[PDB]
Write a protein that binds this ligand. Sequence first.
Ligand SMILES: O=S(=O)(O)c1cc(S(=O)(=O)O)c2ccc3c(S(=O)(=O)O)cc(S(=O)(=O)O)c4ccc1c2c43
Ligand SMILES: O=S(=O)(O)c1cc(S(=O)(=O)O)c2ccc3c(S(=O)(=O)O)cc(S(=O)(=O)O)c4ccc1c2c43
Lengths: 492, 492, 492, 492
Amino acid sequence: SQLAHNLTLSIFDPVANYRAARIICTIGPSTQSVEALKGLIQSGMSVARMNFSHGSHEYHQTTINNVRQAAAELGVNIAIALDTKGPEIRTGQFVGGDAVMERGATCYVTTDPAFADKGTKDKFYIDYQNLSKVVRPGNYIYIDDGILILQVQSHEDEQTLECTVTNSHTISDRRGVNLPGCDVDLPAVSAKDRVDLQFGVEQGVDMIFASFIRSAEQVGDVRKALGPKGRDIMIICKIENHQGVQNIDSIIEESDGIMVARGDLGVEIPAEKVVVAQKILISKCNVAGKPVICATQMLESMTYNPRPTRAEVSDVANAVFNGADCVMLSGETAKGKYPNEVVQYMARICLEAQSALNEYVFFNSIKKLQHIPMSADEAVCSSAVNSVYETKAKAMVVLSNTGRSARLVAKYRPNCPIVCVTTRLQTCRQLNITQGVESVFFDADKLGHDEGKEHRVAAGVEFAKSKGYVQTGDYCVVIHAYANQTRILLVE
Amino acid sequence: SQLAHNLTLSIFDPVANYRAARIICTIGPSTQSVEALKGLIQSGMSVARMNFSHGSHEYHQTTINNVRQAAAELGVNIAIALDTKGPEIRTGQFVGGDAVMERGATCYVTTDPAFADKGTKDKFYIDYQNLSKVVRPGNYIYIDDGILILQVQSHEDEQTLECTVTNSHTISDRRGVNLPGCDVDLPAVSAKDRVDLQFGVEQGVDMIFASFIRSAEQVGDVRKALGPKGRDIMIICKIENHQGVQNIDSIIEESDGIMVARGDLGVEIPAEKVVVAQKILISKCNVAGKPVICATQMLESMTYNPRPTRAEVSDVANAVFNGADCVMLSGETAKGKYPNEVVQYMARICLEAQSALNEYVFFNSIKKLQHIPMSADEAVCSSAVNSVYETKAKAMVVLSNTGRSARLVAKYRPNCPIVCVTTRLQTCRQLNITQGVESVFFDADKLGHDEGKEHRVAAGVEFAKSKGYVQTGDYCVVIHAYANQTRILLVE
Amino acid sequence: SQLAHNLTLSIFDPVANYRAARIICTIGPSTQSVEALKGLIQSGMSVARMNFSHGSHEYHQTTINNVRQAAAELGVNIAIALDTKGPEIRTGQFVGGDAVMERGATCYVTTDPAFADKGTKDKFYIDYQNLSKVVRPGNYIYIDDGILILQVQSHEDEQTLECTVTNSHTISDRRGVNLPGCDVDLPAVSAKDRVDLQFGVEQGVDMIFASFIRSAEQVGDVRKALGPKGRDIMIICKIENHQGVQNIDSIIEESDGIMVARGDLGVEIPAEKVVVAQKILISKCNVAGKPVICATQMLESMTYNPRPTRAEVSDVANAVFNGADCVMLSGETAKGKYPNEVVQYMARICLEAQSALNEYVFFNSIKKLQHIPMSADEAVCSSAVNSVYETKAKAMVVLSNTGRSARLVAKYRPNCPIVCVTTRLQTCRQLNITQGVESVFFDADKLGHDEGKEHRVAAGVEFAKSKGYVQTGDYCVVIHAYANQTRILLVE
Amino acid sequence: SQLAHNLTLSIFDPVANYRAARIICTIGPSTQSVEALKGLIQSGMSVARMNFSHGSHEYHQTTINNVRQAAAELGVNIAIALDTKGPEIRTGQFVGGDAVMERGATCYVTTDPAFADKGTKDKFYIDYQNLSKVVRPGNYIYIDDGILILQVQSHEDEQTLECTVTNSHTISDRRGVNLPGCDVDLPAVSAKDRVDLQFGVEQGVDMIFASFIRSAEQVGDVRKALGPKGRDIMIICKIENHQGVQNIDSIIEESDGIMVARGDLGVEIPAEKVVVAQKILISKCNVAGKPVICATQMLESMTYNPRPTRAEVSDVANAVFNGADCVMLSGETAKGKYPNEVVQYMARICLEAQSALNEYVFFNSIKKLQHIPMSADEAVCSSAVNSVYETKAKAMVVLSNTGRSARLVAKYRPNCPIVCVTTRLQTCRQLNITQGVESVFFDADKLGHDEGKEHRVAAGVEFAKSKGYVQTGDYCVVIHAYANQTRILLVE
Ligand SMILES: O=S(=O)(O)c1cc(S(=O)(=O)O)c2ccc3c(S(=O)(=O)O)cc(S(=O)(=O)O)c4ccc1c2c43
Ligand SMILES: O=S(=O)(O)c1cc(S(=O)(=O)O)c2ccc3c(S(=O)(=O)O)cc(S(=O)(=O)O)c4ccc1c2c43
């Protein structure tokens, strides 16, 4: 019924009084200082991403420290995400640091370590030791962000493949390779990841963006790598190839959420199919009640230009229309010239799209897919959201300690803000990747367990009032316990 | 969707484990004793009806006292209803106590009091002083349960009408007359009614069955006759003629419920149209959320026969299918030979019909008619019933002091029993005219105020457990404070 | 959505301009003459039933001849139904022609032929030779329209059962017996049936009402008994016991329609369960697109009284509300005092009920149960009816040679008349048991095959105009070929 | 329910066997030759757009002639569109052909013709004579594709405005100006337009893309300029500013279709609001049943690059998801380096998006918005598309001479190809802007009138068979005469 909703819209009508979508910002030289982070927060950042593909632990410690300091000074809660380097397939080195590959020419790719240092255009090293047994004749080898394409002709020997160069491209040392038609059987985490994941646990990071997730089993490996002390850290699986896409159901099941890495997917998969995979992955996550992130190549041109392209704007809006919880910035904030302006524009685009989005369509579609009998939690949350639509309530208040009930309510897409009142600061931070929720910390050790729920509900209603969401005479739908209890509250 | 439900049914499946419909019994010489009343209660009586058309105040006092004693000995709460004699139009007396009226003959009906004692076949008295100004030429006068029909030809004078006798019938003294095409402007209540109603209040009757209600204004007159001390007494308007049917919407709005008096309606309205009138009135009350009673000619032949006719059985079942809260027995229990058996059989027909009735059709139809935005009470009660269907809950517990929210929940027709927990014994009695509800009395003077609701909630759950409605691991939907709070409870 | 429809009704609003339901009349002494049949036709008879339980072939030949003559003189088409005696279980004869059975007494029922002539209260004959092997201890034997009930205690021998008399009842010779808890394995047709069925084929009867149908296999036996020359005769299966009810799905599948014989069912099954079985059977037939007849005990009291009871009126109306194509009269027309008046009242009741009935509920419920993909026929007919509702067309015209397409359209319950134009007179007659259809004969041998369909469509539109169904500017939905072609026609 | 559909998708499933969306290509020096036009057609061009902002009548004559020759050699019918230059507001000339405008500086814009040749940075000419009376103080003047922004301070005199230069930009002679907050009251069409439009009619163009449409009245002006001989030519209104968006409802009603000119809209409206405007306009046209074109900035970077950006790809796909009939290429085909490749890639994106698009959502949404009662044409066309879904038909055949009914069927979005059989070659060409339709020309002069429709029906079925849409035993939904007749045909 989005079509019917479109008919009634006017672009000169006022936007909504809240932005549901959440913005993730990659931190770098442009943004690591406390003042720059404060600018980012004020601009609309909810999550600070650390890209562990670059920088040392000391560098990322500065990010961690500065984020917390910036957040404390503004009196907000900012999530900290550790995005892993992950397993990689790279070529070796070349003689003269270069190799001119030409269309029609024959070359030999080998997994023999002896050729790691002495590669040429004729024969060179690829560090993936299972390359030969995974590839068949006819398969393609992509090298250097998929620019150079090789086609496998035959097995020259156990370690060496005879290849045709399908297009002219010059490659340098240690370039990344992709196997578009092959199942890559590299482990879930690299040696570097294990060290980085333990550091993340020690430093109290909120979530892991786990690279190159290909199967459900690998999610559990990441979990093992985090250890017992890292059990409450969210694992967001980055979907980067056909295996991740094909195994999406079982991966979603095990994960705490999904990143749609469009650029990485686009190395192996045609761009038009990636648009569609984005649609599928987001909708599957919406149904699972798990956060989903739209990432890479969002407003890329705004890295060095003061404005992005028109197509980039439509990309951001359509991620929201698709149902994304979050939209992500990489180089635009990490190394960009206009970090504040890009985040501010991203927020503006999201808000505009949201105002056009018919939330009821999401609620109705998701409700109709539920199997009857529903469990108590599911019934309470869907009914609560239904009560919002039926009474035209102007806010929801959800008491949630772990964040579970808040995510379950957000899943059903009410057309008003959700205020989550929680007794855990880490819940405040982790809910920053869930659309349409804002969190209020209730310090139970300071103020009491509030067994009758009245103090926490009042904290919720008050926050909603301070934001202008509700006033005297408005309805507010309250849910508390997982979640098995609902009230329709008249605001005083 | 009753059609689809019919397809899945088997008459060899076991009946439901509860009966939703309620049975009202008229008390008389067959049934006035404490033992006969106990037999009635055990047989399925929820409401004792006193017909104030017959008997003295002392006689009805004995009914009141004996009902209370029988109910107390069985540990149940039974409603007491006062059915008013109502205003009446009667003929006067005749010379020789008889008048042979013949087809084709001319007679004269007069409102002159002089002819009250000396009526003949040629000229006789009718005590309705507004008869002449209300009737036009061509209108019919029905006399003696509509058996004798006269047609008005002209005004002989200000007090006398010239009539044709349309059919041969012999009438005796003081026979009741009907004016099928005329608006009868008799007061809402007679002097006897006003006297009887004050007696009702003194004796603490639960409800009035107010005879011959024709307009909304008239409901006010009953309320005023009940006075400040009778404010909590329900007024059930008896719809007996075309006027009550025409004015049904406004009457319902002012009343606490409706009785469809098929027999009386049938005097002036063709029987097939009364069947449809029954459908309309019941549905309107179902939507209004107010009790509706199907009464007169229910299992009439079982007054003196050990079994009813097959058509009588279908009549009762279809009353239930129509949506009636209550079915009513008159002579069958008042002066009948098989009072226990007729009630037991009525209960069995009702239970059978219910097992074939698709409650969801009622729920959905009524829900769809609700105006959006809904008020909090309406939204909470429909949502709670919806949750029953979604979780396949096996009971509802409703905390309701006045019975209001119990009736609001019952309106939406869950497919499980409703247990009302109330602090007022009169609420327990009054809810006996609401289908699908059983009341549990919680003695606040003896047990406390239960401000946390936990004791009353547990009492409700316990009652449901003792009746075998719920066991360990079943869901129970709990609703309480109007009612703005809901819980989905897992039964321990 | 019948409930929603009830809210908008007024009993003082005009009835519909057509009666959809069809009336079947049993012919007898009261009605066999041509003039009485003409009276019956003019009163509302569409089908003349011949009860072959009584009367000789010569008697029924007079019925057949007189029906055709009466129909020809009024210029209408009247269906002729042969209702078979069917297989029966009877007791033998008694010494003195009588047997006084008393509660508590022991008696012996035997299948030994020697006791056929010499029965007593102690020991008597039952002609069902499989009685002993079909009955277990504890089972009941009903005798004399189920008035006398015996309980089987043990097998006295291979042919004799020891029985307790559960109630006092005096029985005479050759009384009918019932086995409520037993599968009766008597053949589908009796010896008498075979002779009667062949006579029916020779005389060109339109349909058989086949008695005591218990299983799907038996329908085929009736078909075999009709022979190759009787292949177009409709077999309507009379459902009279639990076996018929339990096997209803497979029976409907094989049959051309169903009679719900309430009185016969009521011998073995409690009356309240028969009400429900009526609901189930009718809805299952509505879904199968096969005619269903509500029969026995319809307005029985109008056999000798000038008016029926109020409950009888509600029974007739509720048969229509249930979805019956037809309602049937037995003794009311066969031997009754008021044959014309009873048929006229039956028509009036049906028309009143129909005016209150929400046809869209039937259409919608039936459409939603269709499996997708639908076949072409199903899609065309449902769409055609949908087009009636969407354009508010005032009539349908269906060209059907066998009647198949007309029944398929009628199944979907448009809220306007269906005019079937057919090239077969027998189709005109057979459609008289399908609700909401009227037939126009088009003599193709006289007027041409009308390959372009224009003459037949014009015949349809003209008939609709002559009845006042459509006028200039109204829409008419036309369907022709089974049926794969639709037109929405503007009436000139 | 796009959400539910997304769940069932796999990007590794094969794409649909037809492309519904249509590709419009702008002709220029890269593409004007018969061979280049043939390459365009084979690549996926359905419509040749002539941009009358550039080139002479002789130049466009050559485009017209070459299009017809290329189409004839490939045996296809290609639409020819004349896109008007439209009315324009331009600045005058400058001394030295240049003017350096600086932030903070004051300048004077004048409508006095004397300054047309002698403009400077201080004072210069704007050819819109109503400039002063249309603009208020505070309004902005955009110049040179909205790069230079001026703010009006006051009226210096009747012809001169005092302006602040809000940003530094250097402008040259005759630059286009925009008035974002002002209603431009220029005539619908310029003198050139009126001349060009008469040329269009003489040369038999299929459609006009009318520039800068701001009101419904203006559509009339285009129609009048086309004259009596241009009555069958479609007018597609180009929505380019806030006025066209505001007045969209009345514009749609008067026009034959809409072009959403994102680039032009973007000069005065923020890009994120243009994305939403696109959603609104497309949905409104989908409901109106009129063609809608998504145009400007489609795959722009592919003008000089061999591949587009990832965001450009998503832009195209989302145009299709929005519901666009057509996507349009401008410079990419007019003067681009990869004209064949850009069209081929556009076709591939469109086909991919379509395979993910749930057509049923469109069908249902549009059907639900229809007013009941419906007219015959609307009812027949929605019902035919409904029948496609119900029978899972694999093609539709629509007989449509003017194309009206073809467009009406396409409006309801069946999930199979539509084959229009038409007797007019201009209908074949005009339907090229309607998604999901392929036209078959039936030469009535050479083949007959086909009064029975059988030849045209067979031609439609045959075409569908040759394209592999249907084979033996598939269903095909046939619709013809407006269109009031429907057939569900089993393919032989
Ligand atoms: O390869 S090493 O760098 O020596 C290395 C070191 C450590 S550490 O001692 O705990 O740091 C590992 C811990 C746990 C591992 C698990 S598991 O999730 O714990 O089951 C699985 C695999 S496997 O590659 O999938 O077989 C491991 C491979 C290599 C590992 C470790 C693995
Ligand atoms: O018992 S009889 O009266 O001698 C007698 C006479 C004839 S007749 O010669 O055709 O008139 C029969 C014709 C067809 C019969 C069929 S069937 O449908 O044709 O298969 C079945 C059974 S059965 O009882 O189910 O086994 C029959 C039983 C008795 C029959 C006939 C049966």
